[PDB]
Symmetry: C2
Subunit: 227 residues, 2 copies
């Protein structure tokens, strides 16, 4: 159900809401175990992870919360069905003024357990959605190896969960031609009179064409674009 | 289109993503105005709002960024159509170590500019959704003076945008009786094989039974409850 992978810390931490609770698990040099919880404050650029200083005892601070100690930290994300972010960081500084705060290092990567088994790439590619012999307009919004997200004019033809559609995405900026079709079934949808969005899960052929389409796209840093 | 209201700061800031950009506007006693932007780091409880030190001259820090100076701030929220949060804060401390940070006061309330015109209250009340004489199970998840959000079991009959339905919410813990119907039009829906959620807008009398239902409810700090 949950897939775990290694993600760069910036993207990992962007999934965590500021003020949410962090669970810090510490093991001292002699192996003494200690756990404490405290709110996440935020991050300064990529230099430090700031947390509210936990209310621990003087002995706790002395034996378990020393600058230089490394520790395992768990953070939660409430997005979708929810995800867990696990990483290891070193306690760098403790400030009592102007408010109690602890500064932890930000590692290069973190382990994320989430429901999505793979990433989805953002993009904006116009095309047509074929269903029951009829075509409507659509715009591809994200694409993964196994599916995609697309939107349509809210007043056009609507689709239902389970419907089998084929997305013919324009290969050129002139409309006319289209990449080999992305075929699959409607997995989810969100609609109103203002919006119509759909999550699609490809079938074998659709996966084949997705890989093909993806390969013909050039990245532009944040999104994929025609090329 | 955008409605402005005054919200407690904890809730307003929860709408802002850590690391997002803040726009700081400062006016000196002689009327010199300065505007700069810098990333929001987070907040320590309700004591301070932390931001990365804006990249500005000694000149500008001297005339516009002194401890004690007041400034009006604008933050962004990406939720839904997007929202703006405006508030006034006093610069309390500037720290250079271990990283450059400015500590601002957190006012009790903030002004939020958003698309929703009124608040929606969370709850969990079981009931039935009546449509063409048929009754499907449902759970009311939020309620406002003008509408509500409800979900149904995934295998339940699905409603379409524009459908006129009536929510018969159980008034007692044993089913049996219900509150006067919350009648209205399906405004939006999100659906998959495993979830079915709906946003509903009340008609005139429906708005009346919503007020009447609400008033018959007991508040419990976080959500409303029966009895």
């Amino acid at each position: 159900s949950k897939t775990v992978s290694t993600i760069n810390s910036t993207d990992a931490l962007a999934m965590v809401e500021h003020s949410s609770e962090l669970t810090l698990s510490i093991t001292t040099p002699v192996g003494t175990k200690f756990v404490c919880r405290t709110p996440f404050i935020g991050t300064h650029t990529d230099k430090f992870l700031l947390v509210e200083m936990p209310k621990i005892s003087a002995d706790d601070l002395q034996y378990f919360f020393q600058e230089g100690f490394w520790m395992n930290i768990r953070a939660i994300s409430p997005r979708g069905e929810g995800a867990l972010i696990h990483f290891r960081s070193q306690l760098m500084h403790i400030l009592q003024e102007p408010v109690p705060m602890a500064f932890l290092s930000i590692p290069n990567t973190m382990q994320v357990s989430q429901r999505r088994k793979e990433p989805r790439f953002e993009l904006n590619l116009a095309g047509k959605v074929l269903f029951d012999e009829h075509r409507g307009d659509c715009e591809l919004r994200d694409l993964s190896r196994s599916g995609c997200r697309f939107i349509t004019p809210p007043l056009g033809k609507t689709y239902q969960v389970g419907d089998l559609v084929a997305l013919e995405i324009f290969s050129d900026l002139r409309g006319t031609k289209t990449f080999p079709p992305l075929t699959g079934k409607i997995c989810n949808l969100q609609r109103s009179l203002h919006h119509a969005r759909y999550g699609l899960e490809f079938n074998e052929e659709g996966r084949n064409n997705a890989k093909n389409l993806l390969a013909q796209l050039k990245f532009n840093g944040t999104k994929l674009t025609l090329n």
